[model samples]
Target: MLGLKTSIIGRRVIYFQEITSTNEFAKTSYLEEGTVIVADKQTMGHGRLNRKWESPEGGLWLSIVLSPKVPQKDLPKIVFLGAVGVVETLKEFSIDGRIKWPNDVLVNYKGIAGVLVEGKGDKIVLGIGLNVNNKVPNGATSMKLELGSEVPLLSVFRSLITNLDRLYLNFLKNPMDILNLVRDNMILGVRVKILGDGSFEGIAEDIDDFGRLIIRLDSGEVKKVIYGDVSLRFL
Candidate 1:
């Protein structure tokens, strides 16, 4: 049984053996906000930007329809909150997972999961594709592979959805708490290269209240990168 902790999200799960993309359904489906859509496999899974997400068999492909009263610009923080849940979820298997900033989740410097938030209206569709038990790319890993065993899909899925609901409620009360959770699991105080609004090198310093990356430029000036793409040599 899926032990959910939120009033909205995952209230009703719509599952499919296969689909073009869970996020696609989250966007088009008439299902109410907080409905969770899942699939055992995805043929045309959604990813960051225009990239195609590899959603092979055995992996967990999920998307949620959210319509929080929070401002549209603040939705990214919600995405970040889900990533924190992912970090905790993977940790249950004795893996130390961390957010790679902007979207990807990494374990031992390799990608194990990713998040994609999409929508132009109040109802946002958040898609999360995790390499649970599938064969992944050179630097990708699945939970089953990491544990050297077949991870019971239902158990893992239950844990993930529970965390999502819990974290989301906490986020509404104290957004900083969620941000702190994500920041604590991220790479910090290291030289990094930013690739948006023109390339620049800086020391990853901190995350502001707006969830923007604050990097100290080479000239000893701290610049708040409002919105941009980041590469930790893995992007």
Candidate 2:
């Protein structure tokens, strides 16, 4: 944890007790680019298009390997640098975290944690799933139920690897300061539902700056999404 011993990514640490996926064992472990693969249980955990990532076992399953030469459209700024390092490690146990778009990590709004990226070729395997001191599992919530107790998964994984290596080395030195902190916690303008090729509904606008996801349909037409699955209606 001490400066990641000069992290090449995570140096190297692999632990598993049961696994079906730590991003598929860091994409079939040719790992060695800051390799770090952890798991207490996974049995096929997944997300983004594949969904279903429950990972039972006092969660915090992990994976981290990166080669970063950059660009592949800036790799979604490493999912906003792992949502500013898991919302600053759930705000040091006080909870109240937030970060929705492109990498979910809410608290009072639900969804305990999430971040799953995998690219491999220039190397990239972020995959992190936190539900610290697990308990609220029925569509989760943790950090010991909003910090009433339990919360030491290796001290929140060493403060989430020191705030995801200082916001990914300041996103390799100023990537518009992580796209203005992902457009100030973007959850866009809400009213979405674009699940895939057919199910469409729109509104949720703004995310452009390259992390595309601006939608405005219903004839006004503004669409631009690098991927799909969005559903946030409430207005």
Off by over 4 Å in 1: 1-6, 71-73, 227-235
Task: Report the Cα lDDT for candidate 1.
Answer: 0.79
- Models 1 onward score TM values of 0.91, 0.33
Clashing pairs in 2: 10-34
lDDT against the true structure, per candidate, is: 0.79, 0.74
Model 2, global lDDT: 0.74
RMSD of 2: 15.1
| Model 1 C-alpha lDDT per residue in residues 1-235, reported as the tens digit of each score | 5556567778899999999999988888777877899999998885775567889988888998877666555656877866888888888868788887765788777888989888745587878988878898886888877888888777777878888888877766676677888789987777778765577888888788777888888798887775444444422
TM-score of candidate 1 against the unseen true structure: 0.91
> Which candidate has the highest lDDT of all?
1
